[PDB]
Amino acid sequence: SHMLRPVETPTREIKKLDGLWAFSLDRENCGIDQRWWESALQESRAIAVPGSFNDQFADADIRNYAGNVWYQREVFIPKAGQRIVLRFDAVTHYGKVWVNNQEVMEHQGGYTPFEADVTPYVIAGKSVRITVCVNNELNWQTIPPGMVITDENGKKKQSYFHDFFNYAGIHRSVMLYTTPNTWVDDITVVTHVAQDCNHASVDWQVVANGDVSVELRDADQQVVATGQGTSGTLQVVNPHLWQPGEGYLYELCVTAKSQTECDIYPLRVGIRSVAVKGEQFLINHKPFYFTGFGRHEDADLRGKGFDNVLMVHDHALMDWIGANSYRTSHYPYAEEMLDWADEHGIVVIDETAAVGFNLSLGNKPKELYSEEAVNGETQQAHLQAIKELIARDKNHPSVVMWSIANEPDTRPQGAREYFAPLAEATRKLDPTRPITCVNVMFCDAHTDTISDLFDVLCLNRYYGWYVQSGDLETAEKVLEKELLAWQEKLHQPIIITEYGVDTLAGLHSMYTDMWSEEYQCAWLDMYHRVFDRVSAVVGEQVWNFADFATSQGILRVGGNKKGIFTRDRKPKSAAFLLQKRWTGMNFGEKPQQGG
């Protein structure tokens, strides 16, 4: 449907985000049968929302549990005559909500919010019970996809194809918000600029039988433009347009009035224009250079759960290190991260949860794009995730790119058949932004067959790590050669969205061999040397802020160790190399082929 983030005005929120819900497992799938919605928690225990249920009890048998978990919470209802709505900003994978024995709504998104209108079903003044059924399972039509395997005892074991651990549960806000019966439930805003001198910001919104008078107030509450109608444009003059450095943000207050009731919604948008020209990524008609991380929503104890201290601290670290950009790696991030990126002018490459469409990253199906794995319904679900992501992050000026999928195996015939309609559909959904598909390493420029449909070429390369293990002299030649081959092929702006190596924070060696910090430094350094002599490399993005948790494997030593920082946010030796490089260059500009 339509997605508007709620905000306090003559509108109200009761943060049911309160922790300490009742939590229980359903190892027998008796919950849907035995009507657990009715009343009690049976044999529950205290859990905390937001937060992943896997790491929260230090029980291994819970963290690998694959099935149905039950959340439970009684709450009181203060808003009368207002539309009361129950919003879940994120319930990872599947969630079915119940308000006092009655199914309200359900979702199969994972990292996208879903809400429901509960005005008839509640009465402001008495209690009410909310029971959530959260499913953490992945089959071939989920985004991301997976394979759940039962064995001889019927015990479910979830296997997937991405790297990060499949943290599940309620990860973001659960809120009970309250809006007048004539609401402003959808908005779209597109901005243009000409020579940083003047241009318009077209408006568009959806009401509940009310008219929309829209004003454009300033950063100090000064009206600069008005407008009367459901559509149309409106022009500023000599704007304070949104730059990657500062990030100026106008406050467009929209009004939807009825003959009796009225609703006012303030929506912050910044004037900026993002486009791709040849091999240049232009923000406000200036060629840009991306620097920063591909991070994860990962932490100790809470898993993929959200928390504010992590936001302010992580943004302080990136702010110190000189990073100006990041990419919401492998799933839509919490909207709060994108609000911060909006105010602080942080350019973001947004991505969907489509990751793992690849069976070469080592009882696996034998054809990746057959009916037994990634079929038409996988394509429908992928288009769904695109729809929801764009419908949530469409107005945020910090998003400059949509990324449909991550590292798909494109060698087999049919990858183009699967991905081309999704490129067409995404271009038809949001024309204001470039589109991309992050490229796997074993699909170099001479075997890929998908990168033509996208505006920006994103690359994940690990020459010298997975291949040429320990060889810098050779990985330099290979890396430079394939980079110039991508240039000779597509003449596109090339952002390296992943490049990193594993490093035991504390492992040193005089020989600068793999897994030591000296190898991380020398490796990133050589990669930077190659980066500086390719004209079409419009951005670099290291593989990963900090070490994150992965599934158990013989390649993951307590998870992925390719982070610049540790899981507790401590810098390895390479963090200060990146400090020197990024903070030493001119902001938003590519190095002049050398310092």
Contact residues for ligand E9O, defined by CB under 6 A: 163, 360, 407, 441-442, 460, 462, 466, 498, 543, 560, 562
x/- mask, its own copies, residues 556-585, rule CB under 8 A, reads -xx---------------------------
Q: How far is the CB of 558 from its own copies (least distance, A)?
A: 6
**CB-nearest residue to ligand E9O:** 442
498 is catalytic: yes
- In this complex, which beta carbon is closest to ligand E9O, that of residue 270 or of residue 563? 563
> Residue 510 binds what, of ligand E9O, its own copies, none (CB under 5 to 8 Å, by partner type)?
its own copies
Which residue out of 297, 351, 407, 540 is catalytically annotated? 407
Does residue 480 sit in helix, strand or coil?
helix
> Residue 120 binds what, of ligand E9O, its own copies, none (CB under 5 to 8 Å, by partner type)?
none
Q: Of residues 501-520, which lie at the interface with its own copies (CB under 8 A)?
A: 502, 504, 507, 509-516
Q: How far is the CB of 458 from ligand E9O (least distance, A)?
A: 12
d(CA 550, CA 56): 16
Q: How far is the CB of 147 from ligand E9O (least distance, A)?
A: 18
Listed residue (3, 160, 36, 33) closest to 93, CA to CA: 160
The angle subtended at Cα 560 by Cα 558 and Cα 566, nearest 5°, is 80
Q: How far is the CB of 182 from its own copies (least distance, A)?
A: 52
Q: How far is the CB of 554 from its own copies (least distance, A)?
A: 6
> Is 470 a binder of its own copies (CB under 8 A)?
yes
Number of residues that bind its own copies (CB under 8 A): 27
Q: How far is the CB of 360 from ligand E9O (least distance, A)?
A: 6
Residue 429 to residues 111, 391, 568, Cα–Cα distance (Å)? 19, 9, 39
d(CA 497, CA 494): 9
- In this complex, which beta carbon is closest to its own copies, that of residue 59 or of residue 452? 59
Does residue 457 sit in helix, strand or coil?
strand
Which residue out of 115, 297, 351, 498 is catalytically annotated? 498
Q: Of residues 338-377, which lie at the interface with its own copies (CB under 8 A)?
A: 362
Coarse DSSP helix, strand, coil percentages of the chain, rounded to the nearest 5 percent = 20, 30, 50
d(CA 198, CA 271): 10
HEC secondary structure over 505-527:
CCCCCCCCCCECHHHHHHHHHHH
The angle subtended at Cα 24 by Cα 21 and Cα 26, nearest 5°, is 145
Q: What is the DSSP string of 545-575?
A: SB-B-B-S-SS-SSSB---SB-TTS-B-THH
CA-based end-to-end distance of the chain: 50
Q: What are phi and psi of 449, to 5 degrees?
A: -150, 40
d(CA 591, CA 595): 7
> Residue 557 binds what, of ligand E9O, its own copies, none (CB under 5 to 8 Å, by partner type)?
its own copies
> Is 478 a binder of its own copies (CB under 8 A)?
no
x/- mask, its own copies, residues 124-163, rule CB under 8 A, reads ---------------------------x------------
> Residue 562 binds what, of its own copies, ligand E9O, none (CB under 5 to 8 Å, by partner type)?
ligand E9O
Bridge partners of residue 548, in order along the sequence: 560
Point out the residues that are catalytic: 407, 498
Catalog residues that contact its own copies under the rule CB under 8 A: 58-60, 63, 151, 362, 465-466, 469-470, 502, 504, 507, 509-516, 552-555, 557-558
